[PDB]
């Protein structure tokens, strides 16, 4: 008669690595790395992402006529922008502190658009012939819908002195611009006054822009430039404009109703019409794993990103051949 001491074996082929030995077959293991995704851009916690498609953030916010989809957008969980969106600045130019503004959008979940300067209200200036072939809509020449390109009425561009008081109990994103003409002949043709300026003031802002003339290459069929500027107007504060030429007036200014966790995701992908609680630019994640290796930039309740191809913990013991 005899009694023996021994241990479990089974038909498992799961292997784990150790310092001294690799590919050790064990009886039980636990994978802790999530390796898969659905391959789709998706609603986060039910809340749909703002998918700009081929429009950029600038095009959306300036109201580029190709970005008509994104007039009065509903609130978003996160934003999705392509790497090189074609519908950016239809009229050539620069966006001043564009990256800093984009960063501000990471703290923003919803804008509500409002009119501060009516387009009709320009009774002493011409406001409806401020268009270009670079921004076309339905075959006709158009422009950034949120701002008014002002020109002279009957060969006179009188000084503009416009003020807006922020009576809403919200911060307000105001956008405006300056036009840079090709030569002194076009300056006079558009605004007459040879030397011009735009002064913008708030409690904090103390700005004065002047148009810079230069011979430039044609971009989108135009060698003229537009330089767009922005500010956040705090509640109970007034913004003041004064200009005798080259001024792109604000018609609409976006109102910041909700501030939450958001992000500008960079992705060529479109929309899967799926729901998730953890989103990546490559697709969505649905797992209980403590780790994943899909993509570093995620939004939502996610496992931690690592570069590993494999993370498996031994739970059982060395399995026998």
């Amino acid at each position: 008669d005899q009694i023996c001491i021994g241990y479990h074996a089974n038909n498992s082929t799961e292997q784990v690595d150790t310092i001294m030995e690799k590919n050790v077959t064990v009886t039980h293991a636990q994978d802790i790395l999530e390796k898969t995704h659905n391959g789709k851009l998706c609603d986060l916690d039910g809340v749909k992402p703002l998918i700009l498609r081929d429009c950029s953030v600038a095009g959306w916010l300036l109201g580029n006529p190709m970005c008509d989809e994104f007039i009065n957008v509903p609130e978003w969980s996160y934003i999705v922008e392509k790497a090189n969106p074609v519908n950016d600045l239809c009229y050539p130019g620069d966006f001043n502190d564009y990256e800093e503004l984009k960063h501000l959008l990471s703290r923003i979940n919803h804008f509500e658009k409002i009119q501060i300067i009516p387009k009709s209200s320009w009774s002493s200036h011409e406001a409806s012939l401020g268009v270009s072939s670079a921004c076309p809509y339905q075959g006709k020449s158009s422009f950034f819908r949120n701002v008014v390109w002002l020109i002279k009425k009957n060969s006179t561009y009188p000084t503009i002195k416009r003020s807006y008081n922020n009576t809403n109990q919200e911060d307000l994103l105001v956008l405006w611009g300056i036009h840079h003409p090709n030569d002194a002949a076009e300056q006079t043709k558009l605004y007459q006054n040879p030397t011009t300026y735009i002064s913008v003031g708030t409690s904090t802002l103390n700005q004065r822009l002047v148009p810079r003339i230069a011979t430039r290459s044609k971009v989108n069929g135009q060698s003229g430039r537009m330089e767009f500027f922005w500010t956040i107007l705090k509640p109970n504060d007034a913004i003041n404009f004064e200009s005798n030429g080259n001024f792109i007036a604000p018609e609409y200014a976006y109102k910041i109703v909700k501030k939450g966790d958001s992000t500008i995701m960079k992705s060529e992908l479109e929309y899967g019409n799926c729901n998730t609680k953890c989103q990546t630019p490559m697709g969505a994640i649905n797992s209980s794993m403590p780790f994943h290796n899909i993509h570093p930039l995620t939004i939502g309740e996610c496992p931690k990103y690592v570069k590993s191809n494999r993370l498996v913990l031994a739970t059982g013991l060395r399995n026998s051949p």
């Binding site: 021994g6 241990y7 784990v16 636990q30 990256e99 780790f291 570093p296 990103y305 690592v306 570069k307």
Partner: protein, 163 residues
């Protein structure tokens, strides 16, 4: 393994023992069979469970990447930013892979330890009342029925009776 039991003096495991990690196999006139040792098995289950949760939780707070944009004359800070984000991923990737490697090795040696301690436990009960065969088995000088076998698993093997 460090403790010499698993794949050591006990050459291989038992496909026939399904209700536990460590246990006994007896053979006598009445028959033979596998019986899992619950105490040592449950202790191993607890140690490994805690370990997995301990590992999960230590990694639970770790670096998260964020998207940040820079223009064409901000290349230095763009590059600083990239290296910062990448640098932390290498640190956390290294931590995860190393911890798994180190703790996997400790887990297998833990199992080896538990088998050896269970083997010694039995050895210390039986004393010179059985032959230590050298393979994990003890061969009795006296006839050992299923109650006798049970007393060994009990911890209650009455040495003075069979001596």
């Amino acid at each position: 393994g460090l403790f010499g039991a698993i794949a050591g003096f006990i050459e291989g495991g038992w496909q026939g023992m399904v209700d536990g990690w460590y246990g006994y196999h007896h053979s006598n006139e009445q028959g033979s069979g596998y019986a899992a040792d619950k105490e040592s098995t449950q202790k191993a289950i607890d140690g490994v469970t805690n370990k997995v949760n301990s590992i999960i939780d230590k990694m639970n707070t770790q670096f998260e990447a964020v998207g940040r944009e820079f223009n064409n004359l901000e290349r230095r800070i763009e590059n600083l930013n990239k290296k910062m984000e990448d640098g932390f991923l290498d640190v956390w990737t290294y931590n995860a892979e190393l911890l798994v490697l180190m703790e996997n090795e400790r887990t297998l040696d833990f199992h080896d330890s538990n088998v050896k301690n269970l083997y010694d436990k039995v050895r210390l009960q039986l004393r010179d009342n059985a032959k230590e065969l050298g393979n994990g088995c003890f061969e009795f000088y006296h006839k050992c029925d299923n109650e006798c076998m049970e007393s060994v698993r009990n911890g209650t093997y009455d040495y003075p009776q069979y001596s």
